[PDB]
Write a protein that binds this ligand. Structure first.
Ligand code: KKM
Ligand code: ZN
Length: 347
């Protein structure tokens, strides 16, 4: 039974043109900010990253909400793992000399200059109306409709940290050949401090690898290139993403589902892909069964309080220290009700 599922997907597809026009306004403002950012010595090598839901063709439900990534190549860096977290690091070693708070690169001083240049540049541009929202680093508001979340990410062309060594288990699905090729690619560090936090740490980012894997997702190279080879991987992720967005909208005034994000859904999705490496396990005709495995796996993670980062196996996104048991039990209660009642939150 995939009828309501196929119905949702068609409706979601109709929002494509609206998302495309809105992206036009954003491309204008962003190209301008990058031209002005490149002027400062520190942000000279700044560029547009091209990762996210939109570039992975999985952008569901919000044309008035865009997330943009700004990469900045950093030359010869040394990482120091913070408090055995496996995901959070200190950036040690130059254009960024001004932001060194000891031998360590300050996330706060770095982001303040970034926010400062952006604040200075949005007043100077009169072509379109752009406002900057108060202290996903910098948030803009274009023409009073479009919100743009701007993230700064350091780029390192070094070997991936030791914590990733046993991650990205795509060998039996996408091949070891591909895994080797992917790990040769750079890695990113976004400033994330996650009583009181360490406001000088950087978290690992592999948004570019997630895009590569999603846009070349089959065991067969010709997956989704012909009628006989069409799969439902992307559709299951779109449906999982929409399921959480809809439930998070339904209970916005409650505050339980606040700690859950589309990243939890996407992570759980990649785990299901590792479990089901065959394209035959993802047949378009089996969408109902495939979406049910995704729902089922996600619920097992919520019950067992275990959702490991796809790249950092030792990092548990569903740890009791991150998300309290009552919140996971609320999300379980809601998802189970939905599955039992042919997904009323969809229509
Ligand atoms: C669930 C929240 C808060 O943990 N995260 C996100 O929403 C989130 C969105 N992209 N992304 C990502 O590219 C990487 C990570 C990540 C999380 C934990 C450990 C290492 C990396 N998270 C994200
Ligand atoms: Zn496919």
């Amino acid at each position: 039974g995939a009828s309501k599922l196929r119905a949702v997907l068609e409706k979601l597809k109709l929002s494509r043109d609206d998302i495309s026009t809105a992206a036009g306004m954003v491309k204008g403002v962003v190209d301008h900010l990058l031209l002005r950012l490149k002027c400062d010595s520190a942000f000279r090598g700044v560029g547009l990253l091209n990762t996210g839901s939109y570039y992975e063709h999985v952008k569901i439900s919000a044309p008035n909400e865009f997330d943009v990534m700004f990469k900045l190549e950093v030359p010869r860096i040394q990482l120091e793992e913070y408090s055995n977290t496996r995901a959070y690091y200190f950036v040690k070693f130059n254009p960024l000399s001004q932001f060194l708070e000891g031998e360590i690169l300050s996330a706060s001083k770095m982001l303040s200059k970034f926010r400062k240049i952006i604040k200075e540049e949005i007043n100077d541009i009169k072509d379109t109306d752009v406002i900057m929202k108060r202290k996903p680093a910098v948030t803009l508001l274009i023409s009073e409709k479009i919100s743009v979340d701007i993230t700064l990410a350091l780029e390192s062309k070094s070997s991936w940290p030791a914590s990733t060594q046993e991650g990205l288990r795509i060998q039996n699905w996408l091949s070891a050949k591909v895994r080797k090729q992917l790990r040769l690619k750079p890695f990113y560090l976004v400033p994330k401090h996650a009583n009181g936090f360490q406001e000088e740490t950087w978290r690992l980012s592999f948004s570019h690898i997630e895009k590569e894997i999603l846009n070349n997702h089959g065991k067969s190279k010709t997956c989704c290139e012909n009628k006989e080879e069409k799969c439902c991987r992307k559709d299951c992720l779109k449906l999982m993403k929409y399921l959480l967005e809809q439930l998070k909208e339904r209970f916005k005034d409650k505050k339980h589902l606040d700690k859950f994000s589309s990243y939890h859904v996407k992570t759980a999705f990649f785990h299901v892909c590792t479990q089901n490496p065959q394209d035959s396990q993802w047949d378009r005709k089996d969408l109902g069964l495939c979406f049910d495995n995704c729902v089922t796996y996600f619920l097992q993670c919520l019950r067992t309080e275990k959702l490991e980062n796809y790249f950092i196996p030792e990092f548990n996104l569903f740890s009791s220290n991150l998300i309290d048991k009552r919140s996971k039990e609320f999300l379980t209660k809601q998802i189970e009700y939905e599955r039992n009642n042919e997904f009323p939150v969809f229509d």
